[PDB]
Ligand binder design. Structure first.
Ligand SMILES: Nc1nc2c(ncn2[C@@H]2O[C@H](COP(=O)(O)OP(=O)(O)CP(=O)(O)O)[C@@H](O)[C@H]2O)c(=O)[nH]1
Ligand SMILES: Nc1nc2c(ncn2[C@@H]2O[C@H](COP(=O)(O)OP(=O)(O)CP(=O)(O)O)[C@@H](O)[C@H]2O)c(=O)[nH]1
Ligand SMILES: [Mg+2]
Ligand SMILES: [Mg+2]
Lengths: 166, 166
């Protein structure tokens, strides 16, 4: 069956893992539990197609840089996550996007911009400025909460459909 | 606030109304109740943006043709619906798409291809052939059930995001 190699990237603490586990395990993780590298494989049906989601959950620290080019070159689509309560994480997105273009040799790689933690009241990144960013990248923007499970499947399925039209 | 003029089109009986009412009224209509013209307006928040969905639910009969160019020229985005248990409705999609391109003077209008009734076991249209169609149109394909509410918000929100990147 069709397999789709999705990679979840973003600054430390933005909720990369919480999003992935919500999707795979249908629960929200509230623990402090830094990722080195985690892999998830799940048979799903998306718009009638039976496919396997092969998801690589990454670290965002500078440690993981070398290890980073390796997984970026094999990923077919990337979830670029920031936290809406964290302006530095929003600004970091540009760093991840430009590394992915570098290793993929491509101005256009299947990508979704994900503003996570949208359940939180103390937002410091406006949805309008994340939406102008995404438009300038020519990619979709989707706001998610791993807590309420708002937007989680939307963010992942949208990325799969971007890979499909590539 | 931003308003988005969405138009729902497709052959008679495909579930145009059932999709719209699921979204607006959160119930599934099982009655035989042909549409002439229905309008729905709903304030929603999609990816953090406060916007008004202004939805025009249409008829698919040849009656409604003249009335059709009128609403197609004011629509910003179109849901093109067929039924997965109805091969003639799938084949009709080409007729609706080409009328919309005609009136919009455009090879690319924001559009989503929606295969409805995906809860039904007796499918006559494979998801693979609807997906090749959609790719040849350069638009997303999304399978929905107005009955189970599978894919309903996905189909509408995806169309809004297509309008946003246009
Ligand atoms: N309220 C709220 N908190 C969230 C959300 N998603 C993640 N969190 C919280 O933020 C913290 C970090 O989540 P985690 O999933 O571990 O993030 P990470 O980006 O994967 C961290 P690392 O880069 O080290 O791998 C956790 O306490 C988690 O519960 C969300 O949508 N809402
Ligand atoms: N099981 C199933 N039946 C559905 C679904 N959506 C619509 N139907 C059924 O199909 C019939 C037609 O639905 P309706 O929403 O009226 O379709 P329409 O395309 O709007 C009809 P008209 O073109 O005349 O306006 C109804 O009996 C409705 O309950 C669906 O996802 N699943
Ligand atoms: Mg993590
Ligand atoms: Mg109707």
């Amino acid at each position: 069956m069709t397999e789709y190699k999705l990679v979840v990237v973003g600054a430390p603490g933005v909720g990369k893992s919480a999003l992935t586990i919500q999707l795979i395990q249908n629960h929200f993780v509230d623990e402090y539990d830094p990722t080195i590298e985690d892999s998830y494989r799940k048979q799903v049906v998306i718009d009638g197609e039976t496919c396997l989601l092969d998801i690589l959950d990454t670290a965002g620290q500078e440690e993981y840089s070398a290890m980073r080019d390796q997984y970026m070159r094999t990923g077919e689509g990337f979830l670029c996550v920031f936290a809406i309560n964290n302006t530095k994480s929003f600004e970091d997105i540009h760093q991840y996007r430009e590394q992915i273009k570098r290793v993929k040799d491509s101005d256009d790689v299947p990508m979704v911009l994900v503003g996570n933690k949208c359940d939180l009241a103390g937002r410091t990144v406006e949805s309008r400025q994340a939406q102008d960013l995404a438009r300038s990248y020519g990619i979709p923007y989707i706001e998610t909460s791993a807590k309420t499970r708002q937007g989680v499947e939307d963010a992942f399925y949208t990325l799969v459909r971007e890979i499909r039209q590539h």
